[PDB]
Design a protein around this ligand. Structure first.
Ligand SMILES: *[C@@H]1O[C@H](CO)[C@@H](O[C@@H]2O[C@H](CO)[C@@H](O)[C@H](O)[C@H]2NC(C)=O)[C@H](O)[C@H]1NC(C)=O
Ligand SMILES: *[C@@H]1O[C@H](CO)[C@@H](O)[C@H](O)[C@H]1NC(C)=O
Ligand SMILES: [Ca+2]
Ligand SMILES: [Ca+2]
Lengths: 216, 129, 120, 112
């Protein structure tokens, strides 16, 4: 049986949304396996690295030009397993695609962060990308532990504890306060891996923002 | 370690903890305890952002509006991810000040005739500009 | 510091003092107000800064304001404003009245309803 | 089941549940009486027999009566008389009230 070389998610806005297109040896075709739970969508999203699977559904075919043939094996995958290579597949046989429907999948935008307002980077206001928008992080709880996690992710070195005397050189923000009550205990790898309140809910003002100055 | 914090309000300085004590040995005869700790200010006034407001000598503490959850949570349904409303009940008065917050005011300053309004710090230290 | 208890009994006038201490250098600017109305430069006095015998390098000064006995008995408010370079916002203010600052009694009322509500 | 406290807090009505299980065969009749006087059939809604998935051969149902908040607060009593052939006297009763519960205590401390 063919081994998937990759997934591309064509016919969708960007490459984190669209129709599931398994790369068959040489020419590739669309797949409509039954029991398409979110577990397989999570592995599909992890193939591209977009982020977390949010939704999967099969859409009615009304002159959608589904020229791509269909596969002949199932892909029962536990979701916590590795790439599509390491999940069992049926021994060829017939297809489970009775109703002619395309499989849809909706991944999420990847995370990103930066410092704005500081010279030669490694300093300034904190902006985090989510839902395709940048925003500020509240300073209600900003311990020294929460400062070093941001610094190493951008490779700016250990923070030098600049206090608030030089934190007035960046000013306030205008964007939405995405994060609040951030509590980072361990190093982890990303700020999103910490415990926060929620995306979009806060009790802060643009005057109270977070400024992080690393070594550089 | 044996107590779990439910609410940690700062405006009303209210804190509620619950704990189960293994009294006797029958599992059906263990008491459930609810502790409430309230600190009331005797010098703060009606409006904490206006020094001219009169003094406050009446405090009301509703426990139904204190132990309330108002933040959508994520729920997995094996086919999608949705946001769920915790409560349907969701202008509250702040009795005391908050350390994590800054309180400022506008005051007229006269000198040689000209009047320059300047931002003040009602709180002793709080945060810095 | 509020006016003395045995000064109000004569029913002549009341004196309020604003003590500012622990600062360097020795240039301060103290202005009195009454419920948002700047007061006249004549009703209050101020003294030049003097060294503190206990801790060298920190100074102090005070401003004295007089008021009518009936005006203070009514319950009007007064504010003390000081300008110095050391402050974060460079200006601070404090407020006193009859009900706050060495009072006679304390009247409190407390209500605790919905004590058996849903917590979850 | 005593009525929900939050439902009473919002002050519209109250919900009284009569949960009866563990009878065989499927033959049950529940009624609602107040102060020894049976209530009208238009006061409660009666469910239907349906098997219990856990233990085969057992059926169960329930009945709910809505009461006014003031009527519930005034201290009126309610009961759920049940009839079953397997019962000794063919009549069994369970009764609850506002006072139905366990006595509580109040260790109030005032630090002047
Ligand atoms: C308590 O004081 C605040 C501050 O004076 C009042 O809100 C202010 O109202 C003025 C106009 O009257 C605005 O210029 C300010 O922007 C307001 N403050 C804020 C933080 O927005 C408030 O209304 C007072 N409360 C009561 C009950 O009088
Ligand atoms: C009353 O308070 C004491 C501590 O002051 C505590 O030991 C005791 O358990 C309290 N009473 C009840 C009924 O909880
Ligand atoms: Ca803050
Ligand atoms: Ca917060």
């Amino acid at each position: 049986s063919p081994v998937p070389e990759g997934v591309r998610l064509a016919d969708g806005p960007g490459h984190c949304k669209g129709r599931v297109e398994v790369k068959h040896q040489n020419q590739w075709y669309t797949v409509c396996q039954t029991g398409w739970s979110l577990r397989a969508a999570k592995v599909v999203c992890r193939q591209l690295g977009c982020g977390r699977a949010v939704l999967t559904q099969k859409r009615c075919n009304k002159h959608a030009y589904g020229r791509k043939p269909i596969w002949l094996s199932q892909m029962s995958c536990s979701g916590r397993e590795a790439t599509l290579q390491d999940c069992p597949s049926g021994p060829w046989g017939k297809n489970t695609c009775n109703h002619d429907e395309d499989t849809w999948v909706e991944c999420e935008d990847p995370f990103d962060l930066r410092l704005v307002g500081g010279d030669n980077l490694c300093s300034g206001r904190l902006e985090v990308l989510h839902k395709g928008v940048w925003g500020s992080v509240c300073d209600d709880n900003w311990g020294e532990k929460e400062d070093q996690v941001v610094c190493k992710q951008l490779g700016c070195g250990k923070s030098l504890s600049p206090s608030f005397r030089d934190r007035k050189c960046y000013g306030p923000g205008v964007g939405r306060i995405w994060l609040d009550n951030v509590r980072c205990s361990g190093e982890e790898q990303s700020l999103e891996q910490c415990q926060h309140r929620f995306w979009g809910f806060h009790d802060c003002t643009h005057q109270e923002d977070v400024a992080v100055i690393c070594s550089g | 370690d044996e107590r779990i914090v439910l609410v940690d309000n700062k405006c009303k300085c209210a804190r509620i903890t619950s704990r189960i004590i293994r009294s006797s040995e029958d599992p059906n005869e263990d008491i459930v305890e609810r502790n409430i700790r309230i600190i009331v200010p005797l010098n703060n006034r009606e409006n904490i952002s206006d020094p001219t407001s009169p003094l406050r000598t009446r405090f009301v503490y509703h426990l139904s509006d204190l132990c309330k959850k108002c933040d959508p949570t994520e729920v997995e349904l094996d086919n999608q991810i949705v946001t769920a409303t915790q409560s349907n009940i969701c202008t509250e008065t702040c009795y005391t000040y908050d350390r994590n917050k800054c309180y400022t005011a506008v005051v007229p300053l006269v000198y040689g005739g000209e009047t320059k309004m300047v931002e003040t710090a009602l709180t002793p230290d709080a945060c810095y500009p | 510091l509020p006016p003395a208890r045995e000064q109000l009994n004569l029913r002549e006038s009341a004196t309020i003092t604003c003590l500012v201490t622990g600062f360097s250098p020795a240039d301060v600017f103290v202005q009195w107000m009454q419920r948002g109305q700047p007061l006249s430069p004549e009703k209050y006095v101020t003294s030049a800064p003097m060294p503190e015998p206990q801790a060298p390098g920190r100074y102090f000064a005070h401003s004295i304001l007089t008021v009518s006995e009936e005006e203070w008995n009514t319950g009007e408010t007064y504010t003390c404003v000081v300008a110095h370079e050391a402050l974060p916002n460079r200006v601070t203010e404090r407020t006193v009245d009859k009900s706050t600052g060495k009072p006679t009694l304390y009247n409190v009322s407390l209500v605790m309803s919905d004590t058996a509500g849903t917590c979850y």
